[PDB]
Structures are given as structure tokens and as C-alpha cells.
A paper describes a structure:
Prenyl-binding protein (PrBP/δ) is a 17 kDa ubiquitous solubilization factor. In its 3D structure, it is highly similar to other solubilization factors such as RhoGDI or UNC119 (uncoordination mutant 119 of C. elegans) despite a very low sequence identity of 10% and 24%, respectively. In photoreceptor cells, PrBP/δ traffics prenylated cargo such as PDE6 and rhodopsin kinase from the site of protein synthesis (inner segment) to a specialized compartment (outer segment). According to these studies, regulated conformational changes of the hydrophobic cavity of PrBP/δ play a key role within its trafficking cycle.
Author numbering: -3 to 110, 117 to 150
The structure:
Amino acid sequence: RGSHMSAKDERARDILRGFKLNWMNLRDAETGKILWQGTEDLSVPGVEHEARVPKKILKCKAVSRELNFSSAEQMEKFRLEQKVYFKGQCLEEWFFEFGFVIPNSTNTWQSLIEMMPASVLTGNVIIETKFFDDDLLVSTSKVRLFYV
């Protein structure tokens, strides 16, 4: 009976406690047309988040994403790994690295993200996001997408 807590376990939890995704948007990477804006803290694990995006986003060759996030804790190499799941099948693997995060900072992060109809995809796509500081997994979050 009992458990172990490491310094890395403490740090992971402390980063997550101090971390908040404040807002996020998606634009058509070519035209710059704003497709979706959201304010849900998608860093929160355990729960299933939801996002309702317009059907027209599927016609985009590439999407520009902008994230605004706050962090109480310092991070050396803040990064995201993302998986696009369709009915549990991983369609795409993405990798984004921000780098150093100043303690008690608010930061902005822009990323470029490059067949099935909206009627099939809607409610069946899950984006899983893993938040790291280098080796350290801080959070795993899930967002179910609806194409509306």
C-alpha cells in the first residue's frame, strides 16, 4: 500500500495548475479569413471538450491557428503533440514547439496546419493534444469536433 511522487510529477502538476489556454482562432491560411474563434481552456485534461467549426474549413488547403496562453510556471521547451482521430483511427500526427516560457507570462503562438464529408466527420473527429515541457508530459486533452 502506497505511492511514489517525484520532482517531475510535482513540476508537471504545478505547470498544469498555472497553465491556461485563454483563446484560440483558426483562419484560412491563404485569404486570412477568420473561420473559428474559441475561449475554452483546452489544456484541461480528463474531460471531453467540444468545438463547432464551419463546414467550409474542410475546403481550406491550409489553416493558420493562433493560440493565446498563460503560464505561472517557467518551461524550458514548451511543445504540443497532436493527433487527429477519426472513429479512433489516427489520420494525422502534428508537432509544434514554442520553446522557452517565461514565468507568469501571457504568450501568443501562431501555427500553419496543412475526402470525407462534414456529415461523416462531424462528432466523429477527436483532436488529442499533449502538452510537454521537453521530456515532461504536463497534460493530455481531447476536443470533439463538429462541422457546422
